[PDB]
RNA sequence: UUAAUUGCGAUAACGAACGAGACCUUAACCUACUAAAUAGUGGUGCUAGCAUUUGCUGGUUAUCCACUUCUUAGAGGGACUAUCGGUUUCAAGCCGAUGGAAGUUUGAGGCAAUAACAGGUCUGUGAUGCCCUUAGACGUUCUGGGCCGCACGCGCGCUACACUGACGGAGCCAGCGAGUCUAACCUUGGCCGAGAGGUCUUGGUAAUCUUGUGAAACUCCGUCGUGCUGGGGAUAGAGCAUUGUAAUUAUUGCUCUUCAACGAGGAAUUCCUAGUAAGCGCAAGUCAUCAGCUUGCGUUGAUUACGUCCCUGCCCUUUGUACACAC
C-alpha cells in the first residue's frame, strides 16, 4: 500500500503552513527545496515528503 | 607472517581477551571500556574508569603491574605496550558503569527497589533521554520473577538502537 | 625506492580520511604518485545456530565483517621517507610501509 | 583469405584433423589404447576402438591453439566429467592422467606442441602452420 | 549401404563355458550372461579376438567363438593386464586366476567356508546371515526372512 | 511432411478444437460431495487445450518406441481433424459429458 | 610417569580446546578463531563481527 | 507385502536382427510409399528391430528414394521423395 | 584515431563488450565468426539484430564482442544485447537520428530486451529450505 | 482505506510513548566524479600462423603511449507510484493506461513492543543455589570395547523405476568462498602408474598463486533399443593405494566380477506465485581421513492464481457462558 505515514503527513502540512510560494506546483523543483528547509537524514524520506507536499500543492489549487 | 584476515580476527580476540581481563580485575574501579590503538613498535591501550586514582594506584605500581601482567600473557617485548588511564566522561550515560554499580549495591545488601530506582534517577539527571534496568531471579521467594524499572522512552528496533542504546 | 602504503581496517570512514590525508600530503610538494586503488572488500561470514542448546526451530545467523583494503603508491627519494614516515594513524586502521 | 582454426566449427575440424591423422599414423600408438577407460568416472572404454587417440590429439591440439599454457591436470579437469557413484549423487572426477600425458608427449614428438616458459605446453611454430593449413582445407572440402 | 543378407548360419542360441548364451544381441553384451564375465571383460575378450564388435551373437563364425573361449580360460597368456581379473593373488597358490561360470559360484563357497572354519568375524556373520561389510541393520535389510 | 498444410495453422486449429466449453465445479457446500456445471473462459480454454495435448503425448510416449516428436505430431494432427483417437479430444468429451449430466 | 599422558592428541577434537572455557564439541576453527560457537555469540561484537543482513 | 501395481509388459515379438532376403525385397518395395518415414515408422509398421532401421535409414538416404528433409539428433525425418 | 565505439550488456551475470569500429563487415565473438554459436538453436536469436532492419547498415562496421560469465543461453543473450547496443552506438557517434531513431525504435518494437537488460536477478537463499521460497519437508506424528 | 490502530475522518476526550513504519545491509542503474600492471581496455614497438591484394587470428612486461565502456570500489545521483483518463464524502486511497535499470511498502533479509510458557539447556561457560560425592573417589588419566549392535515400527534424505533415455566421443560457460612461519595449508608445472595415488619442484599471507576453480545439468555426432535389457547398482568375492599409534563389525578412494528389489506407488500428507518452483553442480561449516547433512553461491528454468474462508489457523467488534490449571 501507498498509505503515507503520519511523520511525512504532519511535516508536509507544517511545510505549507509557513511556505506557501516556496513549494512550487511541481515535484522536482521543490524536492530539493524541502531538503534545504528541513533537516532530513534520509534521501528516501525527503523524497516522500516532497511527493505528498507536491500533491498537497496540487489539491490546494 | 599473518594474513590480513587472520590479523584482524586476532586483534579483535586480543581486544576481547584484554577487555574481559580488565573487567574481571578492575571491576571495583568503575571500569567502563578500552580502546586498543596499534602503531608500529609501541602500542597504547587506553583504559576508561571512574576511580582512575585507584586504577594507577600507590605511586603507579598497580598500573605498572597491569602492564607487566599483559606483558607475559601476550608475549610482547620490553617497552612495546604501555597502559594508560583516561577518566570516563558522562559517567551517568555508561551502562557498564551502572551495571557494575548495581552489582556492588546488591552484593553489599542494599535494597533492590532503592538501588534500581536510585541508579535510573542518577542516569537521566546526567542528561539521558531514557533508561531501563531489568532484575530477574529468585526475589522474595523461590519462584523466579523479573522486575522492570523504567522511565522515559526506549526504541527497541532498527539500526538506531545499536547506534544509540548501550546495553 | 617504491614506497607503498597499505591500509586495512573495518571502518570505512576512518580509513577514508587516512587515505585523504596521505593523498593530500602527496599532492603537496610534487610527489607524482598513483591514487587509491580500491581492492574488493573481504567479507568474512561465520554462520552459526542461534540456539545454544539443540531445541528450537532451525534459525541460523550470519556474523559478517568487511575489510576495506587500499594501497597508496609513492615514488620519491629519501627526502620523503623522513616525511611520509610520520604516520597519520587513527584508531582502527593500520599502515605497513613497503619499499620495492 | 584469412581463415584459421577459429574460423571453423569444432566437430568438422576435429574429425578433419582425425582424418589427417589416421591416413598416415606418424604420431604414435600406445600399447594400452584398447584397455583404458579415459577416467575413473567413465564406466566403459571408448567405442572408437581403432582410433580415439588421434581424435583426442586433434581435440588437444585445437585446445592448445586457442590457449597459451596448460597442464596434464588441466587436461584431466577439462576431459573429466560427472561420475555415477552408485546411489550416491554425481561428482566431478578428473580424467586419466597417463592418457593425456601420452597424447601431450606424442604431440611433442611430431612437432605440434612444445614446452613453454612459466610452465606448461604451447602450440608449436610448425604446429601452428599445419593446424591453420587444416582449417584452409576443411572449409574448402565443403565448398 | 552397409546392408548384408543372411544365408542360414545364424544360430538363435549359443552355449559357451557350460552356460546359456542367448543370441539376437551383440557379441560384446551376449557374453555377459556367463557368470563371472562383465561388460568390460567381454569387451576386452572380443577386442583381442578381432571378432568385429558390431556383430550379433548368432552371426558369428564358429572359428571365432573358440578363440574367445580360450581367452576366457587363460586370459593372462593373451596379453591381458594382470589387473583385469576377478581372482587376483589366489590364497592357495598366488597366481592370477579368473573364475568362470561354474568356478565363480563354487570358489565363492570355498572362501566363505575357509572364513567360517577359522571362526573369523566375516565367516560367522556370513553363517548368521547378517551384513559383513559393517552396514547398519536397525532400519535396513528387513525383508530377508 | 504429413498433412501438408502450414503447421502453425494446424497448431492453432487443434487448440481451438480441444478446448473445453463447459466444465463442472465443486459445490459440495455441506454434505459429502456434489458437482455443478459452469462455463470456461477463453483463456482457460487455451490453457486446458495446451495442457491436454502435452500430457496426452507425454503419456503416450511413456515406455514406447515412438519418440515424443512423432507422438506430439500424431496427437496434434488427430486433434486438428477432430478424431476420437486423440487423448485430448477424449478428455474434452469426458468433461463436457460430465458437465452436461450435472447441468 | 611416562604413561599418564602418552596418548597422541594432535589430530582430533582432543587436541583442540577453546581459549575462553576450553569446551569440547562444537568449535569455530575458521580463520583460526579456536572459540566454541555458543560463547562466540556472546562475544560476537567484540572481535568486529556485526550483523547487517 | 502388497504392491497395488501391475507387473507385465505384453508379448515381445522379437524380429529381424540381421537383414534377410525375403524382407529385403519387402523394404525396397514398401518404404517408397511412406509419406513420412523415420526410425520409429518402420519399427512399427514394417516390424524392424533396433540396429536395422538406422542402417536401412542410412541405406536409402545414401542410395536413393527418401531424402533428408531434416536428419538431426535422435530424429531422422525423411519424406516420400519422388 | 580510427572511428570506434564501445558498449556493454548483461543477461543474468554475463558481460559482453562490443568495440564497434569502422570496418568491412566483420562480426566476431571471441575470435570466431557470428555463425558459430553453441546452442545451434538460438543462433537465430543472436542473428536477431542482424535481420530486424537489414544488412545494409552492417556493411561498414565490424563488431568484436568478448563475453564472460553465465550459461550458454546467457552468453547468447549477452551477445545479442551487446551487438544491438553496438549498432546504436555506431549510430550514436557518427550517423543521423533518422538512421538511429527508427533503428532504436524498431529494435524495441520487436522486443525490449535488445537494449534494456533483464532486471531480474537471483534471490538469496533463506535458511530452512533448499531455496528462497522453498522449505524443508516438515511432518508430525 | 491500508501489508499494518497504517491514514482520512468521526468522537468525553486531549496530549503522548513502544511496536509497525522510519532505519541498516545486500541485489539491481550510473558510458557523470576520484582513480588503478594485485582489474582490465585500446594503441606504439618485438614476434608467429593463414593469405598475401587491402586483412584476420595470435603470442610478448620493462616495448612504451592513451582511456576507465566492461572489472572493483569511495563520495554521490536516481524512484516519489510521476502524468493523464476513470472510481471515491469526490478525502484516505484504489484501478488502467501514459518514463524507467527498477511502480506486488523496487525485490530479499537484519532489527524487531507489553505479557507469558510452570517450553529447551545444570552435557557451553573458571555463571550457578541446593543435594550426592572427594583417594579400592562419582575427579583426572591408561588399555580394550561401546554409542554402528536387529525380531520389528516411524521422520528427514540420496539413487531410480529408461527414450525429453543410458553409454562413448566432442563443444563445453559460472558465482560465493577458503588457503603455510617457525608451520607444514591451497597446490601450479614436469615425470611414473588403467586408476586411486606416488614422485621432483614451483607460486601464494592473497583481486595478484591455487583458479578463467575450463564444475555439472546442458548441446552436436555416434552405440543401443521398449528388452527386470546397454535401465537401476543394493548385495558380495578378490586385488591395488591414501589418512592415522591403531582400521578387524570393510574410514575412505581405485580396478575387476556377482547384477537383488524397483515397471509412476494405497489410505493420507509436505512445499510453492517468480528467476520463484524444479532439475544441476560448486564453495564453506564439522575435518588427520570420511557427505547421501547443513549453511551459502551460481547454472537451466515451466505450467498454474491476481481469488476465497470451504478445510486448517490468526486479528478486531458484537453476543452467550454453570470455563479461570481458562473446550
Curated annotation (Swiss-Prot), chain A:
Q: Indicate whether Cytoplasm appears among the record's keywords.
A: yes
Question: What subcellular locations does the record give?
Answer: Cytoplasm
BP GO annotations: cytoplasmic translation; ribosomal small subunit assembly
UniProt KW Acetylation keyword: no
GO molecular-function term, one example from the UniProt record? structural constituent of ribosome
**Keywords for this protein:** Cytoplasm, Ribonucleoprotein, Ribosomal protein
State the GO CC annotations: cytosol; cytosolic small ribosomal subunit
Q: What else is known?
A: Present with 30900 molecules/cell in log phase SD medium. There are 2 genes for eS17 in yeast.
Reported function = Component of the ribosome, a large ribonucleoprotein complex responsible for the synthesis of proteins in the cell. The small ribosomal subunit (SSU) binds messenger RNAs (mRNAs) and translates the encoded message by selecting cognate aminoacyl-transfer RNA (tRNA) molecules. The large subunit (LSU) contains the ribosomal catalytic site termed the peptidyl transferase center (PTC), which catalyzes the formation of peptide bonds, thereby polymerizing the amino acids delivered by tRNAs into a polypeptide chain.
Tell me the subunit arrangement.
Answer: Component of the small ribosomal subunit (SSU). Mature yeast ribosomes consist of a small (40S) and a large (60S) subunit. The 40S small subunit contains 1 molecule of ribosomal RNA (18S rRNA) and 33 different proteins (encoded by 57 genes). The large 60S subunit contains 3 rRNA molecules (25S, 5.8S and 5S rRNA) and 46 different proteins (encoded by 81 genes).
Q: Which family does it belong to?
A: Belongs to the eukaryotic ribosomal protein eS17 family.
Swiss-Prot record, chain B:
What keywords would UniProt list here? Cytoplasm, Isopeptide bond, Methylation, Phosphoprotein, Ribonucleoprotein, Ribosomal protein, RNA-binding, Ubl conjugation
Q: Which organism is it from?
A: Saccharomyces cerevisiae (strain ATCC 204508 / S288c)
Q: What is the effect of changing residue 105 to E?
A: Impaired ability to rescue stalled ribosomes
Phosphoprotein is among the record's keywords: yes
Q: Where is the KH type-2 domain?
A: 18-89
Which GO molecular function annotations are given, in alphabetical order? DNA-(apurinic or apyrimidinic site) endonuclease activity; RNA binding; structural constituent of ribosome
- Could you tell me at which residue positions the Glycyl lysine isopeptide (Lys-Gly) (interchain with G-Cter in ubiquitin) crosslink is annotated in this chain? 103, 129, 138, 148
Can you supply a Gene Ontology BP term from the record?
cytoplasmic translation
What's in the GO CC field?
A: 90S preribosome; cytoplasm; cytosol; cytosolic small ribosomal subunit; nucleus; preribosome, small subunit precursor
Q: What is this protein called?
A: Small ribosomal subunit protein uS3
Q: What does this protein do?
A: Component of the ribosome, a large ribonucleoprotein complex responsible for the synthesis of proteins in the cell. The small ribosomal subunit (SSU) binds messenger RNAs (mRNAs) and translates the encoded message by selecting cognate aminoacyl-transfer RNA (tRNA) molecules. The large subunit (LSU) contains the ribosomal catalytic site termed the peptidyl transferase center (PTC), which catalyzes the formation of peptide bonds, thereby polymerizing the amino acids delivered by tRNAs into a polypeptide chain.
The entry's other comment says: Present with 146000 molecules/cell in log phase SD medium.
The record's subcellular locations are: Cytoplasm
**Recorded family membership:** Belongs to the universal ribosomal protein uS3 family.
Q: Which gene encodes it?
A: RPS3
Modified positions (Omega-N-methylarginine) in chain numbering: 143
Q: Which residues of the full protein are shown?
A: 4 to 170 of 240
Modification Phosphothreonine, positions: 41, 67
PTM annotation (Phosphoserine): residues = 94, 126
UniProtKB/Swiss-Prot annotation, chain D:
GO cellular component term of the entry, any: cytosol
The answer to whether keyword Transport applies is: no
Species per Swiss-Prot/TrEMBL record: Saccharomyces cerevisiae (strain ATCC 204508 / S288c) (Baker's yeast)
Any further remark recorded for this protein:
Present with 29000 molecules/cell in log phase SD medium. There are 2 genes for eS19 in yeast.
Q: What is the lineage of its organism?
A: Eukaryota, Fungi, Dikarya, Ascomycota, Saccharomycotina
Which family, according to UniProt?
Answer: Belongs to the eukaryotic ribosomal protein eS19 family.
Function of the protein: Component of the ribosome, a large ribonucleoprotein complex responsible for the synthesis of proteins in the cell. The small ribosomal subunit (SSU) binds messenger RNAs (mRNAs) and translates the encoded message by selecting cognate aminoacyl-transfer RNA (tRNA) molecules. The large subunit (LSU) contains the ribosomal catalytic site termed the peptidyl transferase center (PTC), which catalyzes the formation of peptide bonds, thereby polymerizing the amino acids delivered by tRNAs into a polypeptide chain.
Q: What is this protein called?
A: Small ribosomal subunit protein eS19A
Q: Which domain of life is it from?
A: Eukaryota
UniProtKB/Swiss-Prot annotation, chain G:
Keyword terms of this UniProt record:
Cytoplasm, Metal-binding, Phosphoprotein, Ribonucleoprotein, Ribosomal protein, Zinc
Gene3D superfamilies reported for this sequence: 30s Ribosomal Protein S14, Chain N
Q: Which residues constitute the signal peptide according to the record?
A: none
Q: Which organism is it from?
A: Saccharomyces cerevisiae (strain ATCC 204508 / S288c) (Baker's yeast)
Instruction: Please give one Gene Ontology molecular function term for this protein.
Output: structural constituent of ribosome
Any Pfam family: Ribosomal_S14
- Listed name of the protein: Small ribosomal subunit protein uS14A
Q: Which GO terms describe its cellular component?
A: cytosol; cytosolic small ribosomal subunit
Amino acid at each position: 500500500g501507498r498509505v503515507r505515514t503520519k511523520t511525512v503527513k504532519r511535516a508536509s502540512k507544517a511545510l505549507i503552513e509557513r511556505y506557501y510560494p516556496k513549494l512550487t506546483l511541481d515535484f522536482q523543483t521543490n524536492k530539493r527545496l524541502c531538503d534545504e528547509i528541513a533537516t532530513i537524514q534520509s534521501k528516501r524520506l525527503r523524497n516522500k515528503i516532497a511527493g505528498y507536499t507536491t500533491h498537497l500543492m496540487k489539491r490546494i489549487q | 607472517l599473518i594474513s590480513k584476515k587472520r590479523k584482524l580476527v586476532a586483534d579483535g580476540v586480543f581486544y576481547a581477551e584484554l577487555n574481559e581481563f580488565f573487567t574481571r580485575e578492575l571491576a571495583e574501579e568503575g571500569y567502563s571500556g578500552v580502546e586498543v590503538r596499534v602503531t608500529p613498535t609501541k602500542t597504547e591501550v587506553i583504559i576508561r574508569a571512574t576511580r582512575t586514582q585507584d586504577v594507577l594506584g600507590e605511586n603507579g605500581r598497580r598500573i605498572n603491574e597491569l602492564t607487566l601482567l599483559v606483558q607475559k600473557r601476550f608475549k610482547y617485548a620490553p617497552g612495546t605496550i604501555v597502559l594508560y588511564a583516561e577518566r570516563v566522561q558522562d559517567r551517568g550515560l555508561s551502562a557498564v558503569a551502572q551495571a557494575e554499580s548495581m552489582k556492588f549495591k546488591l552484593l553489599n545488601g542494599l535494597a533492590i527497589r532503592r538501588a534500581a530506582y536510585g541508579v535510573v534517577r542518577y542516569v537521566m539527571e546526567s542528561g539521558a533521554k531514557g533508561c531501563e534496568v531489568v532484575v530477574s531471579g529468585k526475589l522474595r521467594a523461590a519462584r523466579a520473577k523479573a522486575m522492570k524499572f523504567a522511565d522515559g522512552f526506549l526504541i527497541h528496533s532498527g539500526q538506531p538502537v545499536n547506534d544509540f542504546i548501550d546495553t | 625506492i617504491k614506497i607503498r602504503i597499505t591500509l586495512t581496517s573495518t571502518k570505512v570512514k576512518q580509513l577514508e580520511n587516512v587515505s585523504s590525508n596521505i593523498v593530500k600530503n602527496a599532492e603537496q610538494h610534487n610527489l607524482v604518485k598513483k591514487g587509491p586503488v580500491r581492492l574488493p572488500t573481504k567479507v568474512l561470514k561465520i554462520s552459526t545456530r542461534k540456539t545454544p542448546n539443540g531445541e528450537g526451530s532451525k534459525t541460523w545467523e550470519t556474523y559478517e565483517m568487511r575489510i576495506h583494503k587500499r594501497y597508496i603508491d609513492l615514488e620519491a627519494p629519501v627526502q620523503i621517507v623522513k616525511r611520509i614516515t610520520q604516520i597519520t594513524i587513527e584508531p582502527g586502521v593500520d599502515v605497513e610501509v613497503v619499499v620495492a | 583469405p584469412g581463415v584459421s582454426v577459429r574460423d571453423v566449427a569444432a566437430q568438422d575440424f576435429i574429425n578433419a584433423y582425425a582424418s589427417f591423422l589416421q591416413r598416415q599414423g606418424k604420431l604414435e600408438v600406445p600399447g594400452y589404447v584398447d584397455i583404458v577407460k579415459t577416467s575413473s568416472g567413465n564406466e566403459m572404454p571408448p567405442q572408437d576402438a581403432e582410433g580415439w587417440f588421434y581424435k583426442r590429439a586433434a581435440s588437444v591440439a585445437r585446445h592448445i591453439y586457442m590457449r597459451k599454457q596448460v597442464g596434464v591436470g588441466k587436461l584431466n579437469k577439462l576431459y573429466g566429467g560427472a561420475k555415477s557413484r552408485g546411489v550416491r549423487p554425481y561428482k566431478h572426477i578428473d580424467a586419466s592422467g597417463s592418457i593425456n600425458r601420452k597424447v601431450l608427449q606424442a604431440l611433442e614428438k611430431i612437432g605440434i606442441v612444445e614446452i613453454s616458459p612459466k610452465g606448461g605446453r604451447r602450440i608449436s611454430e610448425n604446429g601452428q602452420r599445419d593446424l591453420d593449413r587444416i582449417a584452409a582445407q576443411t572449409l574448402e572440402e565443403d565448398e | 549401404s552397409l546392408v548384408v543378407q543372411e544365408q542360414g548360419s545364424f544360430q538363435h542360441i549359443l552355449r559357451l563355458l557350460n552356460t546359456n548364451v542367448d543370441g539376437n544381441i551383440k557379441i560384446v553384451y551376449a557374453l555377459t550372461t556367463i557368470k563371472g564375465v562383465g561388460r568390460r571383460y567381454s569387451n576386452l575378450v572380443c577386442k583381442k579376438a578381432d571378432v568385429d564388435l558390431h556383430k550379433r551373437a548368432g552371426e558369428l563364425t564358429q572359428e571365432e567363438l573358440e578363440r574367445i573361449v580360450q581367452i576366457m580360460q587363460n586370459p593372462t597368456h593373451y596379453k591381458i593386464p594382470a589387473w583385469f581379473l576377478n581372482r587376483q593373488n589366489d590364497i592357495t597358490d598366488g597366481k592370477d586366476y579368473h573364475t568362470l561360470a561354474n568356478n565363480v559360484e563354487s570358489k565363492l563357497r570355498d572362501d566363505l567356508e575357509r572364513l567360517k572354519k577359522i571362526r573369523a568375524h566375516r565367516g560367522i556373520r556370513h553363517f548368521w546371515g547378517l551384513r559383513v561389510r559393517g552396514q547398519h541393520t536397525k532400519t535396513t535389510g528387513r525383508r530377508r526372512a | 511432411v504429413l498433412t501438408d498444410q502450414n503447421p502453425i495453422q494446424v497448431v492453432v486449429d487443434a487448440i481451438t478444437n480441444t478446448g473445453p466449453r463447459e466444465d463442472t465445479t465443486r459445490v459440495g457446500g455441506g454434505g459429502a460431495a456434489r458437482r455443478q456445471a459452469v462455463d470456461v473462459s477463453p483463456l482457460r480454454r487455451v490453457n486446458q487445450a495446451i495442457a491436454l495435448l502435452t500430457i496426452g503425448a507425454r503419456e503416450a510416449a511413456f515406455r514406447n518406441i515412438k519418440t515424443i516428436a512423432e507422438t506430439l505430431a500424431e496427437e496434434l494432427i488427430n486433434a486438428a481433424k477432430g478424431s476420437s483417437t486423440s487423448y485430448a479430444i477424449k478428455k474434452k468429451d469426458e468433461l463436457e459429458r460430465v458437465a452436461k449430466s450435472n447441468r | 610417569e611416562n604413561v599418564w599422558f602418552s596418548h597422541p592428541r594432535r589430530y582430533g577434537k582432543g587436541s583442540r580446546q577453546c581459549r575462553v572455557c576450553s569446551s569440547h564439541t562444537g568449535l569455530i576453527r575458521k580463520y583460526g578463531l579456536n572459540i566454541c560457537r555458543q560463547c562466540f555469540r556472546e562475544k560476537a561484537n567484540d572481535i568486529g563481527f556485526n550483523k547487517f543482513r | 507385502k502388497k504392491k497395488w501395481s501391475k507387473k507385465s509388459m505384453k508379448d515381445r515379438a522379437q524380429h529381424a536382427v540381421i537383414l534377410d532376403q525375403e524382407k529385403y525385397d519387402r523394404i525396397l518395395k514398401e518404404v517408397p510409399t511412406y509419406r513420412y518415414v523415420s526410425v520409429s515408422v518402420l519399427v512399427d509398421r514394417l516390424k524392424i528391430g533396433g540396429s536395422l532401421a538406422r542402417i536401412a535409414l542410412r541405406h536409402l538416404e545414401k542410395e536413393g528414394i527418401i531424402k533428408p528433409i531434416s536428419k538431426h539428433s535422435k530424429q531422422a525425418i525423411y519424406t516420400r521423395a519422388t | 584515431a580510427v572511428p570506434s565505439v564501445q558498449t556493454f550488456g548483461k543477461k543474468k551475470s554475463a558481460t559482453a563488450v562490443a568495440h564497434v569500429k569502422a570496418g568491412k563487415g566483420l562480426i566476431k565473438v571471441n575470435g570466431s565468426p557470428i555463425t558459430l554459436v553453441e546452442p545451434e538453436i538460438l543462433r537465430f536469436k543472436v542473428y536477431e539484430p542482424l535481420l530486424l532492419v537489414g544488412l545494409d547498415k552492417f556493411s561498414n562496421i565490424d563488431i568484436r564482442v568478448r563475453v564472460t560469465g553465465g550459461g550458454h543461453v546467457s552468453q547468447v543473450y549477452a551477445i545479442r544485447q551487446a551487438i544491438a547496443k553496438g549498432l546504436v552506438a555506431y549510430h550514436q557517434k557518427y550517423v543521423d537520428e533518422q538512421s538511429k531513431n527508427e533503428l532504436k525504435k524498431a529494435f524495441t518494437s520487436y522486443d525490449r530486451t535488445l537494449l534494456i537488460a533483464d532486471s531480474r536477478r537471483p534471490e538469496p537463499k533463506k535458511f530452512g529450505g533448499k531455496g528462497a521460497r522453498s522449505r524443508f519437508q516438515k511432518s508430525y506424528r
